[PDB]
Amino acid sequence: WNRKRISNCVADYSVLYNLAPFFTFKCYGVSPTKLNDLCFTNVYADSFVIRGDEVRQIAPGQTGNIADYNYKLPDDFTGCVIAWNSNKLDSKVSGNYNYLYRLFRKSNLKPFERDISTEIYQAGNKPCNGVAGFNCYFPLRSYSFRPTYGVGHQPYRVVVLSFELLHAPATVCGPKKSTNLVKNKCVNFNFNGLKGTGV
């Protein structure tokens, strides 16, 4: 997953909750409706295809096949997860085999870690890493996506946004804009999503 660095721009979050390529949502830490007034320092985005029954493991700190073996989310995840019913682009008749998923691995994963190793893991006592067969099951196993599947088995084009609520210089902000500065007067203020009253 390419960690695309989103910074120094205005993010219109109200765009991304309307249409077919962005239809099913879950959010943690920040309400998605009040995203248009808040700001973040950096937001890191990823895009990927995973079967719909496995999208349930895309959650803060949860376990599973793609969790332990493909990608772990942090358990303090402040962000939103955006999916898409992607039968038309990622599924073909009698299987589409362009996406690969891990079912066994030597190690449990740490959040936001990446491993592109295709070494065949030792399921049993038989030696592996070059050997194929029993006790040397293949690491990269496809789900064979078809448009005739039920809803759980469908390929889902899922986008993950990771927001940073750090009190650093925030370069990503919503569609709202600023006003003039007033000094030495009891006024209401709002600074990059921080609402308060004072002189």
Partner 1 sequence: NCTFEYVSFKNLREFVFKNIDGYFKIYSKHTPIDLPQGFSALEPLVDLPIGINITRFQTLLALH
Partner 2 sequence: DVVNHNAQALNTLVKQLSSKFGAISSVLNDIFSRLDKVEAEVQIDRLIT
Ligand X SMILES: *[C@@H]1O[C@H](CO)[C@@H](O[C@@H]2O[C@H](CO)[C@@H](O)[C@H](O)[C@H]2NC(C)=O)[C@H](O)[C@H]1NC(C)=O
Tokens representing 81?
């997860």
Q: DSSP readout, 3-15?
A: -EEE-SEE--TTG
Q: Is position 28 an interface residue for partner 1 (rule: CB under 8 A)? A: no
Site for partner 2 in 10-69 (CB under 8 A): 29-31, 33-34, 37-38
Segment interacting with ligand X, rule: CB under 6 A, options 30-38, 93-101, 109-117, 165-173: 109-117
- Kindly tell me which of 110 and 195 has the beta carbon lying closer to ligand X: 110
Nearest to 159, CA basis, from 83, 85, 57, 90: 83
Give Cβ neighbours of residue 62 (< 8 Å, ≥ 6 apart): 73
- Kindly tell me which of 101 and 112 has the beta carbon lying closer to partner 1: 112
Query: Site size for ligand X, by CB under 6 A?
Result: 5
Residue 5 and residue 75 in contact, taking contact as beta carbons nearer than 8 Å? no
- Kindly tell me which of 150 and 196 has the beta carbon lying closer to partner 2: 196
Give the separation between CA 181 and CA 187, rounded to whole angstroms. 10
Partner from partner 2, partner 1, ligand X, none binding residue 106, C-beta < 5-8 Å depending on class = ligand X
In 96-163, beta strands by DSSP E = 100-102, 140-142, 155-163
Which of 88, 106, 114, 177 is in the footprint of partner 1 by CB under 8 A?
A: 114
Q: Is position 110 an interface residue for ligand X (rule: CB under 6 A)? A: yes
Nearest to 174, CA basis, from 186, 190, 153: 190
- Kindly tell me which of 107 and 148 has the beta carbon lying closer to ligand X: 107
**Residues binding partner 2 (CB under 8 A):** 29-31, 33-34, 37-38, 165, 193-196
**Residues binding ligand X (CB under 6 A):** 106-107, 109-110, 113
